[PDB]
Design a binder for this molecule. Sequence first.
Ligand SMILES: [Cl-]
Lengths: 98, 216, 212
Amino acid sequence: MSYSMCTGKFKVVKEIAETQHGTIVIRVQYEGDGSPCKIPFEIMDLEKRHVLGRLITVNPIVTEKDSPVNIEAEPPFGDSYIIIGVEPGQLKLNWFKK
Amino acid sequence: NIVMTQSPTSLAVSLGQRATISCRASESVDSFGKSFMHFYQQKPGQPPKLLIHLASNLESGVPARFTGRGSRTDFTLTIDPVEADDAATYYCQQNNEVPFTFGSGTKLEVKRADAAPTVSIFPPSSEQLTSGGASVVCFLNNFYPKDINVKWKIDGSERQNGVLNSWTDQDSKDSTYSMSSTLTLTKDEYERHNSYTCEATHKTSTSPIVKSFNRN
Amino acid sequence: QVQLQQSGAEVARPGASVKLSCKASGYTFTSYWLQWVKQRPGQGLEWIGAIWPGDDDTRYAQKFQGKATMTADKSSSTAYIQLSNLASEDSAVYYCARKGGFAMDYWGQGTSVTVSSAKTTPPSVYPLAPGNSMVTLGCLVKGYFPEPVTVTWNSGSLSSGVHTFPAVLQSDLYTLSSSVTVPSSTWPSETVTCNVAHPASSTKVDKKIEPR
Ligand SMILES: [Cl-]
């Protein structure tokens, strides 16, 4: 896939939680009209200048509209921004790892 | 805030040639491996029209003669070949971050063959005169290039005061410009003179195009 | 058929307020951002903000924070923009647009806002008749306020050869002219009429061009 990025908005269904492997889990629900589309996801430093962590979820896609999508990622140690969706209404979540 | 710098402010391109409009961002407009900048076209009296999204994705229904290119901070819009209908103002926009910002705009002038104006003079209407007004109207239509000067004469004497001029935007079909010149006088001054002259001077002739009427 | 129908042109005194409307149809109103863009006369575009009608989420450009207020009504599929403590810098065309995908795909026709203490006055419409081969006729739309006016020929039937000139401002009043060029065979045998509309004064004038 092949699908284009979701153009609409996301709602946080499950807030960031740390796993036993130090990774993070989040659940977001799509609100727009892209039907199946790739979730725009990126982890950055606080100045939004460098891309940092890695996605564990291979290619997160919205399958259904009103169904949450699980996203798991390995953030960098310290402070980072978990960025989800396009602007306006892009989610920018703070995270501190160990 | 991201600043979008468009250059040039304006450019004249001959029909069938290539037009390249530049647009530069003050910071990277990239996110998720995509460039969050887009190109719009605005024709006079109309809302803007989206041409290209995400730097290079042509909108449905827009001719493939329009192409977007670029990443991070440097972007270009290319129109090739340039057509008459392309006479408009082009804007770039970023929506990588809030507030979304636009460029200042680039006016694309379509460069065609020189054409002399079609001059028409009109006396004040009876309706206007019955209400104490007297406007003498002169149309200078379908000319190229845009540069033209109008001179009014009342019984052979030049008149500068009370003259209002207005130019149209470039015609989307024939690439020409048109202009209207209105000489407003009092019913009294109008009624005390006979000869009213509208003299147009354009690149197309060394001699001025002269249209007139006598109040008789 | 995606459509955004905006409310008509408005005049307001300095320090007053206006509430503009944008009726959306042809799509799920609650599944897209509805955005507002400002264009001052002879100037560029500026993004005011966006509203997500599904939950009333807004994003404003800082400069418009105190100035503009975005609301939306789910039931009537209508978005509104309220502009407060009006000043001359607020005189502009206000567009509503749908952010259909990655950018603004569908736009409303725009609402013109004139901030002035000047009095709304209807225009005087005068026929311009000649005193050969192709004949030029015209209409003079004199002394109106505020902008805009709508000029048509034969209720829109005559579209080719028409030149409606930008208005010129003199003594707080606008004056505009429109010309129509038609074959000699078509005038005066067939009627030529200019149709002038001034929304602010609720004026609609049809002026037949009769030969001199
Ligand atoms: Cl946008």
